[PDB]
Symmetry: D2
Subunit: 319 residues, 4 copies
């Protein structure tokens, strides 16, 4: 279409899938919560908290995502970074989908006004009986849809499916997500590497070798640039848009890494794979990992395909 | 505590100075220009480009700050990252202040929606000559006011003057800068180090030693965390808010730093120094460098006092 | 119970009806246009028309509604106030509904910032022929959905369907229409009368008695309060919220009324009747008029049922 | 050039070489009006309806009250909401008295009709300690007056000795842009505005003037009627299109309804500075010495030739 919004896109894909309408509602409701998070994160009401008339952001972000998905009547199992246990959706609001999400990723440094985001992954409930945590304990292969909302210079929702990766820009004037990049694919190889080098002491010998290769090239090529925002959303989105490699690997004081499998690693792994990129743990593909806990951690090396390959060569020489 | 706005703050400080009124109008014009830049960076109206009716961003940032400072009747000389030569203002709109600014810093990566900003530094024409580019070649210690606007997760304008550093959040619901951080001061020592380590090969020997004492500290202490947004305004603002050190040191390519002295290094150094921090080029304080060219490049190492001192002693160990 | 949005409501209503999506996609595309009208009506970006960076409102609304409805793939015949003839939709973007809309009713006095609105009514193409203006010449009982968006104090959409009348409020912080009043009903009787009494010289005796019964109540009761905004969407909505009666009757100048049947009278008559109220020409119900022209005018009297009937007993004394 | 309300008020006080108080006061009021506009337009309404799972005229009063106190520019504040004048705390007092209606018309706000904020500024002329007497000044002593209409769009209209200046809010940046400079009213217009429901209670002179507009004597066009029920909107139409607004003596209101200090006198200043007129029938609104902050007063305002035509009829019945 000429003016393709998230609302039109999500009904067309859907009609194209012969659907009942539940996922379309889930994604329009998730969309609505994304706009409300964006507003508060840009500090909309801040004057009133500072006494203009006289007289928490990740909690509000979680209450928004939760109450919108619940009201969509399309969810049964919800897994959030904020709740230690699975939300079993009250039965008069049960739909057929599992949602795992991080409502505000990077809020560790939200006081320095750094980019943050909302990460989400959506599954079809595997059961046909009673919704359980086990409906959430599915590999990334089974993802119906996954993506993130970036609150940076501007607000962007990225939605990945079998049809591909689609970037929508939020126009704050009218509250519409505007399709602005269709079927995005990654660069085969990039010139950027991304990881917290403040753990350089605790690193794996293969990770140390891959990084020196980027700073000290073996092909007399150009050394890569370094970028690490500290928000996964901003660094993964930079990796999608410009190319390169992002690493939060297993060191030694965290043998499974930091980032969570269900609502951080898997959703980005899906976006990367649909965009022609890769997402390994070192041993297997992040999407191949079988969950055993909802707040499980997994290591992750995602990004441009020839970069994740170059890492894997080193990882296996040291294995 | 009462509520305050950027506008009311700026009007009260000038009422105390019992002066012309040019600097107050200048700051109000920059204020207004930033709120406009913020709206265009947040992509208000992008639906009109994709067919809502049927019927730039770094260049538009320059056009807005240039136009708004000329309408203030407070400027005579203007220097921008975007214009090769200075802009000598029309005589009918001319005033006594020289402004140097980066209209949209970091927007060479804006496609990934990385945090970007507007950096400014205001001087007073100290000369009697006809206005020229030689009026912008004042050192940083002559700065009247400096600061930056950060278009990150939210929009904040950080204003630095002799009275201190003050941080105002942009409330988009009412279009007002709310003061939310009065007379800010930087922590004495931080736990974050900020630099592009992709240049480790061509890094001066002392930088190597300093980053290796943060990665591998022999003092049984916790190693430092690494952060580098790749946009100066976001990296500096994090260094101001959480403490730590930001470094754009000299390397093979860009051997006098890549960052610009008049509108990147000096405004950031003035904010750090007004907040009890420090900012050096290795051999000298950034503010004490006498400029030779308006687009001149300088190295920069800024942030918490103890962290910049720690680098400086490693620097004394690698020099003659 | 739970919060609801227009986008969610219109999608669930279409799912419950096991429909194709055309009405959902039309009503969603008409919503998106309404949010864009509101942003422009509230003068967002007026600063760029006055040189913030150096270098229509009823025509703009029509352009928005037209292109948004055309892009819905749910429309075949489009009748406006701005277009003398109907618009036949290009075949590749053709649907099954016929929309009659007034894209910015009240714009003639938009210089005093009077309340304005977008009135719309949606019919089914009953013809299996080629799309023509003939398809718009359907009576108002054949309406599928009718409503309006008011741009006043706040911006509110009112969407009348067979399920009833529902009022949604635009949250300009998120660009979402929040369901705030459900299955709305009009009061049985009100305390407000609304017409332009400057036409007093020209009223037929039926209007002359009724008015005097409201300023000089025979029932010993209190006199009715007078209100006339001069913008139909504002006067009709007030009559829906507070009850009472709105009148644009047959006078000399404009002898069979001024307000148009297809895109002003019929949509407000459907909202009124679905909310327990009445709308008449004096002779017949507004929804009962078979149209012959798409810009045909009609007398209109609407509002609280006791009030409309009280007039209709007065009209029936001066008939033929 | 691009001229905003903030640029305008700084330049006028720099040319008047003033302390800066008045500039801070109007700039404080400008910030409050932008906050009322956001509330009136229903920002965050989703949060009250449970988007995350979970008073306008009171909020309007609080916003102006606190923005004015914090201005360091006022000493006496009279509000339609506050039954007694507020004496500002000593450690922030200023030299100006402000009478204001924070959200005029908000009675009929369930229908989303245009509402507004009216204000007028005085200089404390007394030598005493601040008190209500500092606000019982007649409207001829006004330094500044005007209104904020929240209609189809938001406009702050500022009237001073320099003239009447109309400014439009760009809600995207939060800036009031000068869109009409040194505004004047038509000598005669073609719109009459009053509640004709109080017809049984009206004075002989009102009934006559009204019937001379609907049933004209000169065989001219009968005048058109417009009555929104909100004064800010009815008086804005009177300033832009011209004509006559009337809230006169009836019976339930022997001295009218609209209050002189924060409704009648403010709009009378705007009209006079725009070449128009504003009378009570007996005297000009600006020349009525008030004894009560919440005192009521009839007001006939609008295009000069039209208000004079009314007065000639009032003098007929005398
Ligand atoms: C790759 C795409 C073609 C998958 C897709 C996308 C959307 N979508 O863009 O919302 C969908 N919506 C719905 C619905 O229930 O209406 C379905 C069918 C349910 C299912 O089997 O998952 C669906 C499928
Ligand atoms: C340098 C700051 C610590 C003090 C400061 C702040 C503002 N202000 O925040 O608007 C000022 N405005 C104006 C003016 O009237 O032009 C002046 C007068 C120039 C001077 O004496 O330095 C002034 C001074
Ligand atoms: C008219 C109301 C009482 C019910 C209603 C409301 C909406 N809606 O709120 O958008 C609808 N949308 C669609 C659609 O086309 O999907 C339908 C089915 C139409 C049909 O069966 O012909 C539909 C029905
Ligand atoms: C009444 C107008 C035609 C002139 C006017 C307008 C503004 N203004 O537009 O804000 C002013 N501001 C200030 C100030 O205090 O700086 C003054 C001077 C103070 C005084 O009245 O003695 C002033 C004068
Ligand atoms: O500070 P670290 O240890 O480098 O971790 C950074 C990582 O943690 C995260 O911040 C996630 O944790 P939070 O969401 O609590 O901030 C990632 O966004 C980011 O990639
Ligand atoms: O890409 P590098 O070499 O790390 O340099 C980053 C620095 O260059 C800049 O991007 C220069 O700004 P521009 O993007 O506008 O050219 C700084 O903002 C930033 O601190
Ligand atoms: O001036 P009048 O005769 O009272 O007409 C008012 C009527 O004209 C209208 O303004 C017509 O709309 P327009 O302003 O777009 O022409 C109605 O909204 C309103 O009911
Ligand atoms: O309702 P009436 O009697 O016609 O009076 C309307 C007048 O009352 C007002 O609404 C003021 O009273 P409120 O502020 O309580 O609404 C004026 O705006 C308006 O001019």
């Amino acid at each position: 279409t000429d003016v393709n919004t998230l609302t039109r896109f999500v009904m067309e894909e859907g009609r194209k899938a012969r659907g009942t309408g539940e996922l379309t509602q889930l994604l329009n409701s998730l969309c609505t919560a994304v706009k409300a998070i964006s507003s508060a994160v840009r500090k909309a009401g801040i004057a009133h908290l500072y006494g203009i008339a006289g007289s928490k952001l990740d909690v509000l972000s979680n209450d928004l995502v939760m109450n919108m998905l619940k009201s969509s009547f399309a969810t049964c199992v919800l897994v959030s970074e904020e709740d230690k246990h699975a939300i079993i959706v009250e039965p008069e609001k049960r739909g057929k989908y599992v949602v795992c999400f991080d409502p505000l990723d990077g809020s560790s440094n939200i006081d320095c006004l750094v980019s943050v985001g909302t990460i989400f992954g959506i599954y079809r409930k595997k059961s046909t009986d009673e919704p359980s945590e086990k409906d959430a304990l599915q590999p990334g292969r089974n993802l119906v849809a996954a993506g993130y909302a970036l609150y940076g210079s501007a607000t962007m929702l990225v939605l990945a499916m079998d049809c591909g990766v689609n970037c929508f820009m939020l126009d704050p004037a009218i509250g519409e997500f505007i399709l602005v990049d269709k079927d995005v694919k990654i660069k085969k190889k990039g010139k950027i590497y991304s990881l917290n080098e403040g753990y350089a002491r605790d690193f794996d010998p293969a990770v140390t070798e891959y990084i020196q290769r980027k700073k000290f090239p073996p092909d007399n090529s150009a050394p890569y640039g370094a970028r690490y925002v500290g928000s996964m959303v901003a660094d993964v989105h930079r990796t999608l848009v410009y190319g390169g490699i992002f690493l939060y690997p297993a060191n030694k004081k965290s043998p499974n890494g930091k980032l969570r499998l269900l609502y951080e690693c898997n959703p980005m792994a899906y976006v990367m794979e649909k965009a022609g990129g890769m997402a390994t743990t070192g041993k297997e593909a992040v999407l191949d990992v079988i969950p055993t806990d909802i707040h499980q951690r997994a290591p992750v090396i995602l990004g441009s395909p020839d970069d994740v390959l170059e890492f894997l060569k080193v990882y296996e020489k040291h294995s």
